[PDB]
Assembly symmetry: D3
Homo-oligomer: 126 residues x 6
């Protein structure tokens, strides 16, 4: 159920990793992925290895949760490629519209929250 | 189970909102919260209203998931106040060490992912 | 120097810890800092010092620059900016950050 | 006059908020807004409510100052959708070329200022 | 102008869309841009143009500045920087962003 | 020599990675590192593995260049822990005051550069 297949980063070609991402992200596959396959295939496999290290096939959180965390982060940090990728990832996993919209509301709240958290020095002088 | 009580942002004093946050965040309560209570209580209630709008008491995601999304975002954006607040929030909810550590690994992966997503213009010229 | 004195002048307790260090170890950089500041915000320019300060304050809050938030907060108080104006600036920075998340949401909304 | 009508968040539908934003932002309207109107009207209404809470009619700052603060933040944070929206808002409000260019210079200076603000640990060892 | 020509010179297809616009509508800002750049990176300074370019490239990637990533990428290719050096710079920027998350994790780790 | 020993990620415990980081970073060691060693050794080992993957012994760039790139990124992103760590790393490697100050000037210029890079939409309407 992971983004890339069991042990795919251990392959002797970048093909399995690339195929799984194209397959699981569809139109949301970042433009940089095919470019890595072509110009830095080792870095693409390292990308897959690192992804799996963080999110093992049978880990602490389910795929829904992992995807929504990644989606929230992408939105809060303004990573267009990651927002598109996780939105499509979520669609293919069949995550619900209500869950995706709540994630969006949460990312929006988080950014607002951070401003207040950074406001102490200002509040102190009022 | 929410961060602030049912309809607390509708109160005629900021006290319920403040108490619930101090209670639910403990030592992780951001320094700016008490300052808001003192100097801009209306903004503190607006903070609580907005929090509840994004995460209704019976919403699309459970409190564990909401907290981990907020935690991931805080870590990825470097909001020290939000990282401390969500870490304590998670502790009080009894979230597992394995779930928190996986969230940390995910936030770390997300930031690495974003760099690759921003790398297309560079990869294109190699 | 006078670039250092003037800054300690209008910032007080909000003077960034890095400013004295620059004066001590990289005076040329402290002068360049003063020069670029004046280029961006000249005397008798397009905006008054109040608006300039509120814009810098808004940005500092939105970007999480602890040193600039404190510095612009003290600067604002020295200029006599009202509590209402400073709190409105904080609400605006808070909304700007929320606004940017919605601005980045098109790719997600498209798939719903 | 504000970006959206006061109390429009209490409207039966999101129509009034959408029309006001389209009119005031023109070609600068973020593509996300029409999508919210279509798929998450409640969030578009909350967007309007939150906007008017921060910037009420006859508040502490005039629309020119509010717009330049938002534009400065947009440039400093690299929010493309906000830069475009506030530039069009500014144009429609009739803000001067000189004021807008000074805002750009200030946002640029702010980002440079922050780097020096974060330099204490480095200068410390020099 | 020559500040504009020189930039189109060493950046080519990677010249930011904003540079010609500045030349057209805010020439004074384009000159200031050129002046501050030279102040930060003078001829015969502390670092060679290769290192300077890789540092700017690393930063652009880490901060998500699309215009600077493209601009520094083209600049690097014009200077003849090797593919290995540019890919190593990308891996480094990627690691720096990962490093910063761990750097911000103390408050979380403390509660485990 | 690199921040940590090559292949140390395969060590039975995190001890070697921890000792090398403490020695090479000194007082600049982030407080998170000892905590990882105590509570999430696997992540400290992966941190070392990922570090050496990006920066292998005898790679394309020398340690001076690698350190200044990391320092520049740290300053530009406001990562306090990284600024302190790379400043101490630089000092221990014996990097010149002039090189470090030029890196600070470059990071400052980079942040200013980015604002202009994001200004097209605004300049467009001027």
């Amino acid at each position: 159920s992971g983004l890339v297949p069991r042990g795919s980063h251990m392959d002797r070609t970048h093909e399995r990793v690339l195929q799984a991402m194209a397959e699981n992200l569809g139109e949301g596959l970042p433009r940089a992925i095919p470019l890595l396959a072509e110009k830095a295939p080792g870095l693409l496999l390292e990308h897959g290895r690192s992804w799996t290290y963080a999110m093992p096939e049978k880990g602490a959180l389910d795929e829904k949760t992992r995807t929504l965390i990644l989606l929230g982060i992408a939105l809060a940090t303004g990573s267009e490629a990651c927002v598109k990728a996780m939105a499509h990832r979520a669609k293919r996993l069949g995550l619900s519209k209500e869950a995706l919209l709540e994630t969006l509301k949460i990312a929006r709240q988080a950014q607002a929250n951070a401003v207040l958290g950074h406001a102490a020095p200002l509040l102190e002088v009022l």
